[PDB]
Amino acid sequence: KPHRYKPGTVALREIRRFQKSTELLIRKLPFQRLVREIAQDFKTDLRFQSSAIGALQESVEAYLVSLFEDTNLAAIHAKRVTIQKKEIKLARRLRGE
Amino acid sequence: KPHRYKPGTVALREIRRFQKSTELLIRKLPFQRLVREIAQDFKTDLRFQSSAIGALQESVEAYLVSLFEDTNLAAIHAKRVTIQKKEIKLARRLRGE
Amino acid sequence: RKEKRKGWNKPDAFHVCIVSYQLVVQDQHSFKRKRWQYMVLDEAHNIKN
DNA sequence: TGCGTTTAAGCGGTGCTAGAGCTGTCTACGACCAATTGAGCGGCCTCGGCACCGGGATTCTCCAGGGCGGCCGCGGATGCATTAATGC
DNA sequence: GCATTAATGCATCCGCGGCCGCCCTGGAGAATCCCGGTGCCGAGGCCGCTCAATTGGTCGTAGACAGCTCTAGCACCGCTTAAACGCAC
């Protein structure tokens, strides 16, 4: 007989795995390409150091995870598990934007 | 047949009246005695003038009206009008406290 | 008070107005607007101050 | 949630050059002090803008009477029970 | 004296009918806007003061100018897995 886990049960174990891990979830090449695109449409002929990129991605994942518990709290306030657009919009409005 | 306004009709007009008006909504003497008694425990023999109280009053009601406004936003996000405990709890949590 | 003053300004609805001592001290703004001929005080020992 | 695959980062390594980083030099260039006067400022007393209420035109909300398909009070039957004059 | 049988007081089970409440239309009344109307008071223009912004000179001093040094960013090359996408229930 096949062994299929109930939906969402794998979610708890992947949450457990990701909570103990401090590594970044974004590959270096797409992030660097996006930053270089911002430079390209920002100022022509710009150079990037090997450093000054870790701070970018680090601040981004910190901001993203923070906004994620804010939107999770907003969603659980709505008496539902699934997040939606109003949740993230309300979280952004209340946080100071 | 007495003429009675249906509930909620007068609420809109009080909102309209108060939104166009910028006067203090807290009686002066209760606020000043509150301030005196809360300053008592920190250190006795306080001294307050006519000024140095209206500033606290104004900061307080501005903070409170802002809190009520984003509480209204949260309650609207909850698909209802009546405010409730958890509304002000998560408004305080989200705003930075 | 507003009801009594709804015909206060334009017509001559009254030839004499009777007011208490402690109501003028609240409605000076409305009272001083109208022009009067005779104004009388009773037991002026209170206003002796 | 689970699977086949495919587009693709991670990684080991190079040659450089545009570019970051440390160093004399003088040359603009401001820090500091007599000296002044002139604009910023303390005080004042007034009229014009402002505060608050009046009179209606206007705008807004909110009341009740009237025509729509179902009703719960009543009366009688005519059976259940009682009852009194009479044959036995 | 006892059964008895027709006369009589209800017996309780429906038949019927008195019994309303909702939408749509009828204006009715409270609230608002808005400037006269006059009293109030403070904003500010004017008068007199005073102190620091400006002027010039003295004098020393930090930064642009190269000038040079060296250094890692990048564009490039090719292997090794490796998650992502589309699909399907």
- Which of A69, A94, A95, A97 to mutate to probe the B interface, most B CBs <10 Å? A94
Tell me how far apart the alpha carbons of residues A56 and A52 are, in angstroms, rounded to a whole number. 7
**B62 CB within 8 Å of a chain A CB:** no
SS (H, E, C) A70-94: HHHHHHHHCCCCCCCHHHHHHHHHH
Query: Which of A78, A86, A94 minimises the CB distance to B94?
Result: A94
Which nucleotides of strand E lie under 7 Å from a protein CB?
29-32, 37-40, 72-74
Tell me how far apart the alpha carbons of residues A35 and A48 are, in angstroms, rounded to a whole number. 9
**A93 CB within 8 Å of a chain B CB:** yes
Say whether the A–C interface has 3 or more Cβ pairs within 8 Å. no
Summarize chain B as % helix, strand, coil (round to 5): 65, 0, 35
B1-97: CATH number:
1.10.20.10
**What are the residues whose beta carbons fall under 8 Å from the beta carbon of A88, sequence distance 6 or more?**
A67, A71, A74
Number of residues assigned to chain B? 97
List the determination method: cryo-EM
Instruction: Report the amino acid identity of residue C24.
Output: V
Residue C30 CA: distances (Å) to CA of B28, C2, C18, C36: 27, 10, 14, 13
Question: Which residues precede gaps in chain A, with C-N > 2.5 A?
Answer: none
Summarize chain C as % helix, strand, coil (round to 5): 20, 0, 80
Find tokens 């979280």 and name the residue. A91
A·B CB contacts under 8 A:
33
Cα B82 to the center of its chain, rounded Å: 16
Cα A90 to the center of its chain, rounded Å: 17
**B94 CB within 8 Å of a chain A CB:** yes
Q: Taking the domains of chain B in order of start, what are their residue ranges? A: 1-97
Start-to-end CA span in chain C (Å):
28
Computed over its alpha carbons, how large is the radius of gyration of chain C? 12
